[PDB]
Design a protein around this ligand. Structure first.
Ligand SMILES: Cc1ncc(COP(=O)(O)O)c(CNCC(=O)O)c1O
Ligand SMILES: Cc1ncc(COP(=O)(O)O)c(CNCC(=O)O)c1O
Ligand SMILES: [K+]
Ligand SMILES: [K+]
Lengths: 385, 385
């Protein structure tokens, strides 16, 4: 039984875009507003304010650490999912000829970093087909058939943003560690959709690097995200974008080394009030139930929506089995085109999004989504054909 | 005649830390709060919201451009001063043996980037003495005596954060362009203190790269800054940290090239509401008078404080002539030590800061600062000896 009242934005609209950005809870806006007030009353720049900011940062780092069941030292605070990927990709000691493998469902922004890396260090990159494994096949086996002697890193999204498939991460990791080549194969995971929807425990689930954001499923404000790096991989990642937050200081205030753990990849002044907003959102989700309970609630909503769409004659879900998470992608048989359809729905205050590849429409159901909203969506979709 | 009422934080304290972070004006907090409301009512992720966000970004880019009298295409929006420096430094095509020259008054965070760059590309770096040129000498001449055949870039703070000196940027640029070596010498300027206090016109003042932030003298919120790159230098800067905001898109949503002008160095999701806050703070300053008028007002206040300190027997200003800007640094003859003195002042709600090198105390006077605040500071300082 979710407390929908904590998310005022739900009230006069039918929202299904949590994957793009979550509806901000009241407690998050209160924390943001309270931080501006604290800074105005006590600083904004002063011993008291600077200490309050450092304490707030430690508190967020700790809440994130607890969310994934890991030590705070493995957590880096960023502004979004992408930055975490930039940190890992630019930090690796690349040699000409090294190879990177990405799935064919990765984000355009991520592909751009890889192209930038290829141009700078002379590495190469290839894609491997996973989109087609939504209803059959094995993504891990596809990867195994693409691994080569020069493969050094694999990049994949845990929950695919376009089709809604949850990749078999554990099996994929095993395939990578089993491989014998010039390098021990490592895996960088884009968790833009998975973090905050799927139950994640990095002490049970072995991962190398995991990038995420707080503004989508975690329902925090735009501008705050994070990155997990396993303690055994920290040494392989050289800091790149650095600043006063990245170092330790000497007698005369001179740089003497890298800050502890993930702090070495943090740069400088950030939007502190927003950090308090994310912290408040994180604590709110825990009061609603465990990650597991919230996950099952999300799946109950997506399946209900999925079933409803299966009944509509001119709508075709991409998944032939129940969604493994909160994402439900589908096409609509109509002369209008998916972008015009999404715009018409928004005109009715029903919010979904268009996907470029494959060309389809995507809806996100969260644990706070209810049956009336789903039925209202189904009702309006019934109009096209 | 400044409208102090627009800056509510001034009221029950005596603030002199504008160089660390400016007091946020009411119109800025209103704009931030209003943006959260707009996102909640119209999205937060949707056609309407996404368009509103893009329009806000263009509006801020344009206001910044007008502030420095340049074309919007030369402006990149970042989170702070440091990021701008990381973009320029990591973007240059460094070759082993290349040399970087920095003043001995640069920020620790900036030095850390340079050290990271030296380790990665095998370049070298050396400092040149400018601190000692506050009351005598010529910083441009010092630089001329250090320039070598392999010198490729010079890094300097336009307004020194530790001593308050305004470097002779025009003369320094001439010296650099006059030099004949293996590379045409370029200059990266750290404008953490100068932007928003000194009148800056990059159409009259020729500069290569100029990094700045909006949270200090411009009085915007923590988290939003920017970077200027001359059109003739854009090509030499390769994008490094990139994301979906850095590229142009193709038919199937794939990367087809770099976004226009400075957009190529912008990454991904940011704290949009804060952008509206900086935009509002920028427009507020323009309503108070021109940059020149505000600069003279700042100097009238700093000289008044400087004169006041010269009268105190146990206080010694670092500058033997009137401050060239709003920064007034000084030492205090006392067994207590400068950090204990700053803490005691804060106990009395008087806000200044300690400087590590040279070991001194620094006060910042803005155009909104008044005589009562300065006299109150002088009164409490009189207590030490
Ligand atoms: C799989 C995946 N990876 C990266 C992003 C970009 O996130 P940002 O926080 O802006 O760095 C996304 C964004 N998805 C929004 C959506 O799917 O609607 C993503 O899905
Ligand atoms: C000269 C100089 N350079 C960089 C910074 C860092 O700015 P950030 O926006 O956090 O990247 C500063 C900060 N100064 C604060 C102060 O002077 O009190 C600086 O001075
Ligand atoms: K159907
Ligand atoms: K004196």
């Amino acid at each position: 039984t979710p407390d929908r009242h904590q998310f005022p934005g739900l009230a006069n609209k039918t929202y299904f875009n949590f994957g793009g950005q979550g509806i901000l809870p009241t407690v998050a806006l209160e924390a943001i507003t309270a931080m501006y007030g604290y800074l105005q009353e006590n600083g904004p720049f002063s011993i008291a304010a600077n200490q309050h900011i450092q304490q707030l940062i430690a508190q967020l780092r700790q809440a994130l650490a607890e969310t994934f069941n890991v030590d705070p030292n493995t957590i880096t605070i960023t502004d979004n999912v992408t930055t975490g990927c930039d940190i890992v990709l630019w930090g690796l000691d690349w040699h000409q000829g090294d190879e990177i493998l990405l799935t064919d469902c990765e984000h355009p922004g991520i592909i751009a970093i890889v192209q930038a890396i290829a141009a700078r260090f002379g590495i190469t990159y290839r894609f491997f087909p996973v989109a087609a494994t939504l209803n059959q096949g094995d993504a891990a086996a596809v990867l195994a058939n693409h691994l080569g002697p020069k493969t050094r890193l694999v990049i994949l999204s845990h929950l695919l943003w376009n089709t809604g498939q949850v990749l078999p991460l554990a099996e994929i990791m095993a395939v990578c560690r089993r491989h014998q080549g010039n390098y021990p194969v490592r895996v960088l995971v884009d968790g833009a959709q998975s973090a905050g929807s799927l139950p994640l425990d990095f002490s049970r689930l072995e991962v190398d690097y995991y990038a995420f954001t707080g503004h989508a499923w975690f329902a925090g404000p735009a501008g705050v995200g994070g990155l997990y790096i396993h303690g055994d991989c920290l040494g392989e990642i050289n800091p790149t974008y650095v600043g006063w937050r990245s170092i330790t200081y000497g007698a005369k205030g001179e740089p003497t080394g890298w800050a502890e753990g993930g702090k070495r990849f943090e740069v400088a002044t950030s939007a502190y009030p927003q950090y308090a907003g994310l912290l408040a959102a994180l604590q709110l989700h825990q009061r609603q139930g465990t990650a597991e309970e919230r996950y099952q609630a999300i799946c109950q909503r997506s399946e209900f929506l999925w079933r409803g769409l299966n009944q509509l004659p001119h709508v075709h879900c991409l998944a032939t089995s129940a969604p493994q998470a909160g994402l439900v992608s589908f096409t609509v048989d109509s002369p209008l085109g998916h972008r015009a359809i999404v715009q018409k729905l928004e005109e009715q205050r029903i919010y979904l999004r268009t996907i470029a590849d494959p060309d389809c429409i995507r809806a996100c159901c969260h644990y706070i989504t209810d049956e009336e909203e789903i039925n209202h969506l189904l009702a309006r979709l019934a109009d096209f054909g």
